[PDB]
């Protein structure tokens, strides 16, 4: 059980925050990411609409079935692609979404195309605001009205625990980048420390801790990049390269994490199964740790 | 970090207990179960000799390859199967084994067989002293000679985690698992607090806490009963099955156990390699915590 008074923010829908046990993990898919063979044209963002809306319709069964909810993580690396890719998921989904790029030119660009629309200040999750920001993209994310923000601690500068806490908080001469994201307006922070490699996660998770120790905000990462670049593992093939990634992928929320970027969609049919399994052990745990289940759509109440 | 210093027993060259990331999990696969089907006949102890060997060597090889040590858990539902299947352990591993038996009649009349036989008393582990132990069960480990037993410190009248403490050092007029131990002449002790269900296993989990905290006994536990009988889950197929037991499997660990009873030995290989990436993470944290491993066969520097 952590310190701080937990924020739990309501998403469109998506609840995602608390004590451990009290919400189900939130489940962050990856659509549209660099060669994703349903994307012919990257640079114009042209992709088969049938695949990608299959790739969203199975996300929405499986969420069903374990009550894991879910937000898209949409990935462009074109301000044309990024903007088509936006307008698709707004209209073929109700679920919240990343809106992501390796390129912060790419994602501002995107934003100035969507503009001041009520639907994509409820929905559209900025990710995000890290060590390279500069106070167009904050200005960019403030035009837009923009209220929730991945803020990501990934960092070669921040590798121990405590530096990303600094480089979150802020300390001598920077803000930090949760007081950079409230200028921007965000008033809702999904704290992502960053996976460097898979045995590092354990830091990950720390920084993870220490978040809801200390602030309260919803907790989360991204160890998909980590886990793909395993050559060792990797080369084993099914079920040892799954078995590996469901290791790493649940080791956070043993700790008490919140939300998963879990890497390709296509992935989202076994990540599902082992991380509702681990949700459902913890929320057993509710009774000796004084927390309530937030609501009855809980892998616990669902998966046996 | 634990308060009581941890036992680390020392069982035929396998290390088990200790602070986490200090000594890697201690994998207990299953063989000769009821329904495995390389045993032909379960009374008369008639089976495939080549199939056996070829899983004690798989067994072998994917512990060198991870760095978690092994103990065979060699189960029996007669006399005559459990005597020759131990003779052929012996034989056929250097491991260490759990003498086991759903019944404690077919435990003592191997015990009985096999005798005070130097061998017996550093390899055989019994399997296990509970809640229903005789005085006749006593008799027949102490003609043996053993030194390590597993205490399965389970009760419907000791549910929460904090009452193995009652279970372990007795209570009120009954006599502790532990004081049972010693009269048997026991002086090491592998604490297993039972596993009822997948979802109760966040209460195992807390009981070997619990175990770990005040006594320092090296905890562990046998999810695969609990796995196997989740036919929603088996019938799903691979990858499904396999993540949701990686789930199961690795959530003791993550919260400092010492050792797992995984189930049937024919799924070692996806087993062990979803333990070793949680082992992994779990000693990276050492380099925050000051925790030094006890042993360069671990899967942190191995697996990678
Ligand atoms: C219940 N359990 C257990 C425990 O909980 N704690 C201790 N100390 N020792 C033990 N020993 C026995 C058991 C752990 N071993 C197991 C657990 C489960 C199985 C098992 O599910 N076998 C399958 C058949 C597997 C097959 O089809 O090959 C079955 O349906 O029976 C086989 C062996
Ligand atoms: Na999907
Ligand atoms: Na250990």
Same mark, same amino acid.
């Given at each position: 059980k952590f310190t701080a008074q937990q924020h739990v923010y309501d998403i469109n829908g998506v609840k995602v925050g608390g004590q451990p046990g009290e919400y189900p993990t939130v489940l962050i898919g990856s659509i549209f !990411?660099?060669? #994703?063979? /349903?994307?012919?044209?990257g640079q114009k963002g042209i992709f088969d609409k049938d695949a990608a809306k299959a790739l969203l319709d199975q996300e929405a069964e499986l969420s069903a079935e374990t009550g894991n909810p879910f937000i898209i993580d949409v990935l462009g690396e074109s301000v044309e692609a990024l903007t088509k890719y936006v307008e698709f998921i707004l209209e073929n989904t109700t679920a919240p979404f990343l809106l992501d790029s390796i390129s912060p030119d790419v994602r501002v660009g995107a934003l100035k195309n969507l503009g001041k629309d009520p639907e994509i200040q409820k929905r559209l999750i900025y990710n995000s605001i890290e060590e390279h920001y500069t106070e167009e993209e904050l200005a960019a994310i403030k035009e837009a009205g923009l209220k929730t923000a991945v803020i990501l601690a990934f960092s070669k500068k921040a590798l121990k625990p405590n530096a990303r806490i600094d480089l979150l908080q802020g300390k001598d001469d920077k803000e930090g980048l949760i007081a950079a994201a409230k200028r921007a307006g965000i008033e809702q922070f999904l704290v992502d420390p960053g996976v460097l490699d898979v045995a590092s996660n354990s830091w990950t998770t720390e920084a993870i801790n220490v978040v809801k120790e200390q602030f309260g905000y919803p907790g989360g990462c991204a160890p998909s990049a980590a886990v793909y670049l395993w050559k060792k593992m990797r080369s084993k093939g099914t079920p040892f390269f799954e078995v590996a990634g469901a290791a790493v992928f649940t080791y956070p929320i043993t700790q008490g994490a919140d939300? /998963?970027? !879990?890497?390709?969609?296509?992935?989202?049919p076994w990540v599902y199964r082992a991380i509702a399994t681990t949700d459902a052990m913890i929320a057993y745990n509710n009774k000796l740790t004084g927390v309530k289940m937030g609501?009855?759509? #809980?892998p616990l109440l669902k998966i046996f």
């Open positions: !990411y660099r060669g #994703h063979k /349903i994307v012919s044209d939300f /998963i970027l !879990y890497g390709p969609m296509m992935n989202a609501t009855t759509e #809980h």
